[PDB]
Design a protein around this ligand. Sequence first.
Ligand code: CDL
Ligand code: PLX
Ligand code: PLX
Ligand code: PEE
Lengths: 178, 52, 606, 459, 56, 175, 64
Amino acid sequence: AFSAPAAYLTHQQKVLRLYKRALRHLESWCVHRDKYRYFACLMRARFDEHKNEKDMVKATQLLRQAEEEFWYGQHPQPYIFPESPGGTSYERYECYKVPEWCLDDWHPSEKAMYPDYFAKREQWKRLRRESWEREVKQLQEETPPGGPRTEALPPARKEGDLPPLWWHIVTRPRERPM
Amino acid sequence: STFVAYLPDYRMQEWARREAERLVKYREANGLPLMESNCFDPNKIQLPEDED
Amino acid sequence: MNPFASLTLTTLTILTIPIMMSNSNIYKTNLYPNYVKTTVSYAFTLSLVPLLMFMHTGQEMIISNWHWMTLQTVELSLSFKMDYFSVMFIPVALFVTWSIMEFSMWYMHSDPFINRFFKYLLLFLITMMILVTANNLFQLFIGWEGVGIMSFLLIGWWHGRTDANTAALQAILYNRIGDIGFVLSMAWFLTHSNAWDLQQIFMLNNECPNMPLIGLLLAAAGKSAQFGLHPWLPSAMEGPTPVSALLHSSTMVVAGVFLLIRFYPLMETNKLVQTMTLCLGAITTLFTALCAITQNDIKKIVAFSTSSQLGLMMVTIGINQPHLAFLHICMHAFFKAMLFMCSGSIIHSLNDEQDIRKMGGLYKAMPFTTTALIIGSLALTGMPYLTGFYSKDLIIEAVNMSYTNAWALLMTLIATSLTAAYSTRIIFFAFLGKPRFPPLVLINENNPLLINSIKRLLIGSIFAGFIISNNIPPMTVPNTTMPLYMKMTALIVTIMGFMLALELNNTTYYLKFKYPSQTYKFSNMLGYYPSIMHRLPTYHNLSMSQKSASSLLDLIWLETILPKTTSFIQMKMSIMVSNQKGLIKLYFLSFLITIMISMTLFNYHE
Amino acid sequence: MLKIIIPTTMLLPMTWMSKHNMIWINATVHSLLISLISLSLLNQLGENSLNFSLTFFSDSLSAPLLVLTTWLLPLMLMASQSHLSKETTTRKKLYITMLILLQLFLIMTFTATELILFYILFEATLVPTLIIITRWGNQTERLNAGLYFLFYTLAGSLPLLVALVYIQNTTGSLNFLIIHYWSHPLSNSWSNIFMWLACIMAFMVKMPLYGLHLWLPKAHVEAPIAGSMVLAAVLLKLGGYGMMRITTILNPLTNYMAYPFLMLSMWGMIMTSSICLRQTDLKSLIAYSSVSHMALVIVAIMIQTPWSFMGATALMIAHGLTSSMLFCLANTNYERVHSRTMILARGLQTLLPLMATWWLVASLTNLALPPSINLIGELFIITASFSWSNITIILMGMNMMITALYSLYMLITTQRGKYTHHINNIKPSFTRENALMALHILPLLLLTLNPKMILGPLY
Amino acid sequence: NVLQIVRDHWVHILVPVGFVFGCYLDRRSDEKLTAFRNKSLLFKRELRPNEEVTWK
Amino acid sequence: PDSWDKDVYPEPPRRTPAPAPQTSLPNPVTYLTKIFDLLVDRPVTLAREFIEQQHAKNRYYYYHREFRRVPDITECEEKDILCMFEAEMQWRRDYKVDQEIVNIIQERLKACQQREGESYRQNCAKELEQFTQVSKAFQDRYSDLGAHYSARKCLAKQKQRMLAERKAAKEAAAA
Amino acid sequence: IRWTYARSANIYPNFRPTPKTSLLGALFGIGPLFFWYYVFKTDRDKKEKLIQEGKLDQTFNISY
Ligand SMILES: CCCCCCCCCCCCCCCCCC(=O)OC[C@H](COP(=O)([O-])OCC(O)COP(=O)([O-])OC[C@@H](COC(=O)CCCCCCCCCCCCCCCCC)OC(=O)CCCCCCCCCCCCCCCCC)OC(=O)CCCCCCCCCCCCCCCCC
Ligand SMILES: CCCCCCCCCCCCCCCCC[C@@H](O)O[C@H](CO[C@H](O)CCCCCCCCCCCCCCC)COP(=O)(O)OCC[N+](C)(C)C
Ligand SMILES: CCCCCCCCCCCCCCCCC[C@@H](O)O[C@H](CO[C@H](O)CCCCCCCCCCCCCCC)COP(=O)(O)OCC[N+](C)(C)C
Ligand SMILES: CCCCCCCC/C=C\CCCCCCCC(=O)O[C@H](COC(=O)CCCCCCC/C=C/CCCCCCCC)COP(=O)(O)OCCN
């Protein structure tokens, strides 16, 4: 979810995605491990059968029939990892994620506790404040006049700079905030 | 809320209950029907001349 | 005064004490869950006494303590019924809830809001007690909606997750559908019997008509998740495992069957409503087990199992055996709750993994959980002389010797087989074979809370059926003369289901792969009922709410008729009236015409 | 009755002679004291009303309305002082004067013995509300909405006057006691039909009845918080009070003429409840729920049974309190994000837990959770309608199903989910707002223990 | 020092006295509707040997 | 107890069976009853007797209000407001009393149904008959008046019923 | 803002009375009212006719 998407998926990416999806659904069908290994080797051989096809029209047609066969033969209840978009713990811990700016609204009595943490937070805030203009200038100078063609962002190029648009990426709450 | 809770019974609910007990006792002891079908005495009602 | 009324009232009273302490300096300390668990255990111990009194002398009472109000000739007062059903279900519910809180003290140890979770469970228990002990229909409705709202709040415990909120709202909708029938029955009873309590309703209805009983049946179908309104129960598994074990497995979901049991004197007189109840129970107990036999989520399998058991209870009600239905409720609570705790223990030990395809050999890795689930599956399938034998087998034999719809009997037998089928599925795919979980082994069950909580309900699921069955007076006429083939039919079908399920499960070991058939697709996708009924009616309603109700009517035509037409007419009239060039030659001619008109039309007609 | 009217009048020179920084404190304290004094009117009789004098009287129907009207003013002052901080002293005093005048007019309206005085005050209530909406509203639509508030009511209320002065020319009096005691049946004629229409539609517009309800989603949305509060809590109940009062002279024609209005109301429940399901505006959702709830009271009054009247009174009081609380809760979010779009700010339970609890309680009370007085009124109306006709249970229950749907949805959209990332100005809830919700909700739960106080003269 | 309190807190007695005044104005009204005092058929009674009016 | 009247709230003589044991095992119910009596009942009755001694030191009384009989609506003239008002108030009081009578009968029926257990259908025929008679009378009097009811409407209903009965009697006498 | 404005404030200015719009509005705003009126009138006339001839079993119907 970190990599910027492309305008389109090439043929190689489509075939790789189909291979991974078919292997996952085959594992869903073949519960036992040895049976899954056997049929995964069979599927890998089936994929390697046309590994060096140079006719792009034929390759596209083959991929289309493979997609049709997968859609017919897909598992109605495929295995999903618990934290995956379909899993049983996908967005379980979002209620515990609190943005850091809320810490700015704490009462001074609350900030009396954790003094070192708030000193380090003040240091982080000063560091963020001192480097915003340089990041904006870098984005302005690197971006083509028409506009950004993709969502990819450039890294820091000088010595005392930080990568542009870094605050919210670095200051993510947590994966297990509580 | 305390003032509203302890408001005197000006709706006369307990009074109505007590009158009900007295009347139930009287009609059950005398054997009269517990409740009459006519609330007004028919002797004081002057109906029209005839049914036709 | 006899101690019966005082103890029965105090049992419910002391459950509310930890709620009043939710604003004290015990709610902000990590000792609150233990405090609530101790309170529940003490409440169970106190409730054990009226049960003993009833087993001694069969003593029953009603306590109308607080007079709420009086609408003319109708009096509403806070009244509690302490008959056999209340004094028997209260200790069972308290025991199950105590075990569930003890389990939750270990399951939800890392939750930042564990105190709120425990107080929510206690509030649900209070609402359930209010539901059970209610003597009038208004108090029963209070408890009904209380348990509904508590279920809504506990299903969406993780409110940052979209699916939990969706499941909670779905449960609310499906329960409101039956709340419609509940309100219908209440209105009919108020209008015709001039009462909402049970005594006058029973007195004034020697032959109850169709409508109130149909409303009660609709409410029961909504609460117990019968075939018409089933899908909310399987989806209520989004919440924490203790919520599923306590609310949606053994205690809250039996509310509809309990409501039908409470009105059994009226149901004895209407044959049509009994037939409808029997048919609904049969179709539910068939369909839910048919969906269960192919599920991969263990919690889903247990949810479909409990829905099938509820369907069996409704079938039992349909054949005029209410006491058998109540006895089956009491028996089912124990082993269903402990099966859910075993499932939760497995899930916790496998790093929050619920798919049975990634659970391998836990027979030796988790010996105590394994033995507990084996005992529970045996009790659920009706193994003789276990807890479930004393209710389920008698239910089957009662259906076999009644003037019954033949299809209902056949579907009940097939569901009895499918119960053993899915029990075999669970055992085979969760405890037999080789491990299929991630190699970093985190299996650990050596926690005293978990062990004691499971062990108490294990002792229950072993001995409670025999203990209860031998201490209640006979409430029916026994079936002492049966043919041998029909005396063993439940055992025969359970055994046969065991064998076919085991054979088809061992079939999966072969190195053969083939695409699924249409029957498996129908069974696995829940008969395509959620895939259709949650998409077509919802889409049509939400599209009509905006296309016509909001845009076409409110924003266009209602504006067009009264206000916009008035504005247009007034503007046109103003433009016509005020458009004069100011030349005297025109309106003096107008004056001449007016003078002539006044001289002719008015002056000539005096 | 003057022991309540005169202090309300004295609130004006008090406000105008107060310090520049002391108007709110004194106004709130003395309005709360006036509410405490007005609590004494709840001591009603079981046979006849409290006839203070030839001009003012109090029955069991108008006592809870008086108590609610007097109780709302301190809440309006508490809710208004936040967004009027930068306002000048003179305009603050003018706003407080408008609120006091509205309260005084409502107090006199709910206690007038004669119908012409009741109409005069019931129409005089329009001016302060219109001034508030059109002067202290925030958007440019506030002018147009004001017109919608002004001409919808008058077009319905002007014929009513023509009816009232007609009745006094035939019966000789417009006193309510004489009208009740000397009541005569209405013949079935076109003249009597139009007299029935004239005496009724003025109160149908203020309910508002479905079809004539377009002014409400405008006026409630574009008004300030206090304007919307007084519109939902009290001003909607004027139509119900007047209709319950005036239905005495309409029998037996009410049996025949109520069918179109009954059909409109029973279908408008479903229409407005469905409209609430698709509403991008939170304040508009609350406004439409208000109409959905008032259609029930319309049906209850139209069917003319004691149970229906008790249910209508209880539902009116409960809806007033609930709608006021919901409008306050929405205004709290608006004062943070400065937008009424419901999906703009999400996951507010994580950031404002106690306000989320207030939201949950308000939503639960809105959908008539037992044993709240909302549920009591709704159930009484349902039973009365079922006695009127069994088939009605098909519609009412359906409405109930929708009522729980758009309520919890409203709770889910704003409180649950995940917080929107770009918003970072959500400050912790102030003590003033929390106290406002507490004072909105605590009497609501307290009235459960003593329902007979809000069940009207038919109890 | 009494002025320092009175001159800025007299507005706090407008509503209190406006209450009591109202009460007085109620009682006078009751004096204009005494045409049936101790004359209704339901509450007509023989006066106590010392009292003068059944109610004020 | 003497708090209420036993003629208005009757109940059967309360036949109970004497304990006749058969096994030698101890009875837990008896032990728990003794514990409840020693631990709960005695402190409660001690506190109540203290409260009663405190109450006896201050004895004051309250009275049931007696209402005279005023002429009904039948004796009032067409537009004579005072007697009309008095008769309407008396009618409202009688209506409330009738409501409470129906309430008492309903309470009797409820107590019957709960007390008789499984024989309630047979042992409570008298209560059902009394409730049926009282309900029929109340329905004849006050039903269908609706909101805005009055003594005049009830009198009109009674007059219409009397006309119907007279017509039915005349029709029957012609056979 | 564009979405909310289009859904709320931009609808009437872009509305034109057409046969489709008129027919849909008439149906969805008029048909249900008369349908429910007919249903309720039929039921109530049946009930009143039953009451007039005195066969409804209105016993214990004290509250209404
Ligand atoms: C005591 C005297 C009585 C003796 C009776 C005689 C002896 C027994 C009779 C035998 C009866 C069936 C027994 C075999 C079980 C079936 C298992 C199987 O492999 O089936 C293969 C196949 C599914 O296998 P698969 O897809 O290859 O497996 C994928 C992988 O294995 C995926 O792997 P997996 O891990 O996911 O596992 C999937 C799952 C299996 O996946 C499935 O879901 C398929 C199994 C379906 C079970 C259905 C059984 C009962 C159904 C009742 C339905 C009522 C009517 C409904 C019809 C509606 C019509 C629209 O496997 C299991 O978990 C175990 C299966 C259950 C075994 C235990 C069953 C015992 C109860 C049934 C027998 C009754 C005994 C007691 C009766 C007592 C009465 C006196 O299903 C079938 O082809 C046959 C299904 C049987 C009924 C379907 C009828 C045909 C449907 C269309 C008919 C034409 C309609 C035209 C239109 C009409 C419109 C009006
Ligand atoms: C934050 C932490 C929360 C949890 C901890 C809470 C601790 C426990 C506190 C909760 C108590 C539980 C309540 C249980 C019920 C007991 C109270 C009950 O007994 O009192 C009622 C009494 O309550 C009152 O009737 C209701 C109060 C009136 C409410 C009015 C609100 C105040 C006015 C505000 C204006 C708002 C506008 C209102 C518009 C109408 C009973 O009514 P009644 O049967 O008679 O009494 C019989 C005896 N009498 C007659 C001699 C008095
Ligand atoms: C969007 C919501 C706005 C508010 C809607 C208010 C609804 C107002 C409708 C009024 C209801 C009843 C009014 C008159 C009663 C009956 C009407 C008529 O349909 O009944 C027949 C009337 O017969 C004919 O239909 C005459 C009426 C025909 C002409 C009227 C035009 C109706 C078209 C609909 C206009 C839309 C109304 C709203 C305007 C904006 C009965 O036949 P008949 O036994 O002989 O007459 C009995 C009445 N008597 C005793 C007085 C003589
Ligand atoms: C926001 C929109 C609200 C609409 C409000 C307007 C609807 C009001 C209904 C019409 C009011 C007119 C009635 C006036 C008062 C009636 C008093 C009365 O009884 O007089 C009648 C006379 O009744 C009339 O003359 C009224 C006729 C109507 C004249 C004005 C027409 C206005 C439109 C009428 C039809 C529309 C009604 C519904 C409007 C729908 C709005 C959506 C009898 O008098 P007599 O001459 O003595 O007869 C007995 C001796 N032979």
